[PDB]
Ligand binder design. Structure first.
Ligand SMILES: [Ca+2]
Ligand SMILES: [Ca+2]
Ligand SMILES: [Ca+2]
Ligand SMILES: [Ca+2]
Ligand SMILES: [Ca+2]
Ligand SMILES: [Ca+2]
Ligand SMILES: [Ca+2]
Ligand SMILES: [Ca+2]
Ligand SMILES: [Ca+2]
Ligand SMILES: [Ca+2]
Ligand SMILES: [Ca+2]
Ligand SMILES: [Ca+2]
Ligand SMILES: [Ca+2]
Ligand SMILES: [Ca+2]
Ligand SMILES: [Ca+2]
Ligand SMILES: [Ca+2]
Ligand SMILES: [Ca+2]
Ligand SMILES: [Ca+2]
Ligand SMILES: [Ca+2]
Ligand SMILES: [Ca+2]
Ligand SMILES: [Ca+2]
Ligand SMILES: [Ca+2]
Ligand SMILES: [Ca+2]
Ligand SMILES: [Ca+2]
Ligand SMILES: [Ca+2]
Ligand SMILES: [Ca+2]
Ligand SMILES: [Ca+2]
Lengths: 91, 91, 91, 91, 91, 91, 91, 91, 91, 90
């Protein structure tokens, strides 16, 4: 799953890889859950996909907080733009 | 791109799709850049990959903030875990 | 995301399609989370990966129960083997 | 098919990997068989695809029972929802 | 799933397509099961994978027989080489 | 290529793997040639694609015969259904 | 299978597409076969893979001649280098 | 890459692998270039893609000549069909 | 990430690999951003996608300059065609 | 080949898509060709792979120049860093 050999990567780089790829899979799942919620024709199934959808968002937030704590630039940029107002392209 | 036909998906659901898949590509690039930074043997190349790495994080934070503003659950869970202390699971 | 056109697939068949692909993605996440839990070197991250792992199983269990209720054969074969004793094969 | 090197994965973990991916491929086959049963224009082929479809369901139930016996959380969450008559999201 | 538009493909050609991809998925499962039977360290699981392996072969034989009946050259070449003594390259 | 390391797979299992993936590629080629035969608008090309199509069937039959000779269950199931009459789900 | 809509692709361009991708599948099969011929441990299987290998070469040659006849530049460049002597890097 | 381990493949065979995949990638590019030439709406871009298209054909011819020189059955079949008149299937 | 073993690739060859694949993902990202800018229905998101798009171009320009400095042929061909007028295909 | 429907994509955007994917496939080929030159054991084949490699760079330069002419900020950023001296991050 890593493009470079494990012998040359820093231990922190591999851990962030494990954390980043997790966020990717969680973000991807939220998108697919949400699409199937709109297209679903069974309300009982829609409730399940909607419930798991929101649980993926929670998992994404957790891993993102971990990235924020173990990466200086994630902390800088996340603090710059998240929980703000006005244009997002200037903060 | 979307698993379900666009004619049955909401307009805001497709916008979030565009935002989510973007963050995925942003996170993926951060992971790959960081790995190549560790394995690179050319100092001038390492500087470029490290610079673009941090700009990918910035782009991810921007697109992530947009999701927070256009989805209540994203706002709920991101507020719960981001910028906190103590165990990330105990919250 | 379907091999046959939706203009010819029954309504129930597409709903099961949405549920099955969800179980696959949830089962897939359980496998990958567990692998990272063993390989992770950061306890803080391992705690997150282990928590999200177990909630994905819950999502799989929920979506799988729906399949049991909307397909006579899923109900027959699941009831045959789930929560049995002795060899899984013959019994 | 694993993502982390086997040298760091516990033996008990690799076996669960073998079972999970099997369930995925079996669940996937059910989805594709069922679609091709609806779209097929030859009754003889329809009989075969429908027969093998149900045989994949049987295989999934078997492998899924093995997971129930060799993973605590699978048994906990499967017990909560499988073979229940009330609403799923409230169990 | 198909490469050419469905409007120019004969209805029979599409039925054979549905049969062929099924055989491919069946053959694929037989190989993967067998590889996992050798590597599995849990007998309970090895027994399950071995059972489903042989059940996939049966599904492959059925779907292949349908191809033999709906294609002149499948019947010609299969009857030439299946169930023969001596070198296969000579019959 | 394979899924488990070749140092735990028995010699015979890997040989069958080589045969199975070969058969899959022949079946894959037959399905694609036939589709291009129906959609092609150039007679000289259709003749070539149709000729190579039938040569793939012959290659598949040869490899299948080898599987029959080197696997007891392939021989059992192929003998049951190949070259039969009546509903295929009855033999 | 095509990248641009068929509405704008000339009839002849789509036919060459069918011919080119066929050669690719032919070339791929030759390579796959040759590799398995070296690694196979069963002479009977090796004989089959070697036989089908050379027939894949023939199919590639046939489809390639068709390309030469239906494209002036294929004819120009193929004639320059095929059946020549001396260092190939020399028009 | 390769399907069998490099340590069991003959140097002879790996070189042809490198040559075959190159022809594959060049053939693929010729098809993609030709499609974009038909769909392009900018004459300047169409001229460039058409120019590179013909240069990919030349690269394929060179690599093919190398295959013809380092494989007897390539030399036999390429001579049978290339630069011939009359039906291709009867040559 | 590479096709040939790393122990046979020259050092400068692996660095250029890291640089080339980086440009690929950036070029890919520029295209995807632009497509979403056209399809987006939310002006706030469109501003973000447009902002990151142009910053991806800057990252590509940086990496390309590095390739120009670490490869004599990139420098030769880039100097021939970049920042020119008249028919590109001429020079 | 596109992710969004062609009816919402502007004409000029689809053309840049066609040009970008070409540069992508050409850059990929340069990398793959180069790896096979280092690992090849046949001098004749190496000469061919090395020859096509450098012409693939030429194809990339041509297509890349077209992007520079049909996209303002490609021209701006390429003008900033290409044919420069000293650190690139500056
Ligand atoms: Ca996933
Ligand atoms: Ca989930
Ligand atoms: Ca939770
Ligand atoms: Ca999750
Ligand atoms: Ca920035
Ligand atoms: Ca970016
Ligand atoms: Ca939960
Ligand atoms: Ca499968
Ligand atoms: Ca089956
Ligand atoms: Ca059974
Ligand atoms: Ca099965
Ligand atoms: Ca009850
Ligand atoms: Ca049965
Ligand atoms: Ca193939
Ligand atoms: Ca023959
Ligand atoms: Ca073949
Ligand atoms: Ca050998
Ligand atoms: Ca032949
Ligand atoms: Ca063939
Ligand atoms: Ca390519
Ligand atoms: Ca090329
Ligand atoms: Ca030339
Ligand atoms: Ca990407
Ligand atoms: Ca970047
Ligand atoms: Ca910048
Ligand atoms: Ca090119
Ligand atoms: Ca030239």
């Amino acid at each position: 799953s890593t493009h470079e050999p494990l012998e040359v990567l820093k231990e922190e780089t591999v851990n962030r890889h494990r954390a980043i790829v997790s966020v990717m899979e969680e973000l991807e799942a939220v998108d697919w859950y949400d699409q199937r919620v709109d297209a679903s024709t069974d309300p009982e199934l829609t409730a399940i996909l909607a419930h798991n959808r929101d649980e993926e968002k929670e998992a994404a937030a957790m891993t993102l907080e971990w990235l924020r704590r173990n990466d200086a630039k994630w902390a800088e940029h996340l603090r710059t733009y998240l929980f703000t107002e006005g244009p997002i392209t200037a903060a």
